[PDB]
Amino acid sequence: MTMGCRHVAGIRTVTPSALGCEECLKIGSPWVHLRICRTCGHVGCCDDSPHKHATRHFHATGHPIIEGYDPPEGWGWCYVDEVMFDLSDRMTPHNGPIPRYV
Ligand SMILES: [Zn+2]
Ligand SMILES: [Zn+2]
């Protein structure tokens, strides 16, 4: 899909902390789509969502590469690069059934 930047060389297959955006789950609120780090395994709603968990989390932890978990297409977005590359065979397995609200 896209040439992976050096950041990709340090990402692995991780395990999600929840069945969706943990922050949204804390208040029982829906999400649009989910982005999980290929590092800490923590999930978050995209910046397309008004909650913006993935973006604030990125700034908080420094995890620039996220994967679409809610849409398990198998791609990795690197915030600092703005490039979306392929993770088709490395895609994170489901730890449960993700509640698609939207
Ligand atoms: Zn990068
Ligand atoms: Zn993270």
Side-chain angles (χ1 to χ4, degrees):
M1 188 177 183
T2 305
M3 299 180 185
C5 58
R6 68 287 303 170
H7 288 121
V8 189
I11 63 173
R12 59 144 63 152
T13 305
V14 296
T15 308
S17 192
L19 308 171
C21 184
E22 306 88 329
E23 227 65 84
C24 302
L25 295 175
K26 90 197 301 177
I27 54 181
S29 296
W31 57 75
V32 184
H33 294 294
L34 298 176
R35 300 178 176 181
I36 180 180
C37 301
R38 296 301 310 217
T39 324
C40 74
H42 206 84
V43 196
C45 46
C46 51
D47 67 302
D48 183 73
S49 309
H51 206 120
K52 297 185 175 183
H53 191 233
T55 47
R56 293 186 180 213
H57 173 98
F58 163 55
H59 177 249
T61 52
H63 296 152
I65 295 183
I66 51 86
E67 176 176 78
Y69 197 40
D70 161 89
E73 301 171 74
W75 52 262
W77 180 275
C78 197
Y79 287 110
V80 292
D81 292 66
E82 294 186 275
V83 299
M84 182 169 54
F85 55 92
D86 52 281
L87 290 176
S88 188
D89 290 289
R90 295 177 178 161
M91 63 171 60
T92 312
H94 63 262
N95 65 332
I98 299 186
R100 172 63 69 76
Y101 299 103
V102 287

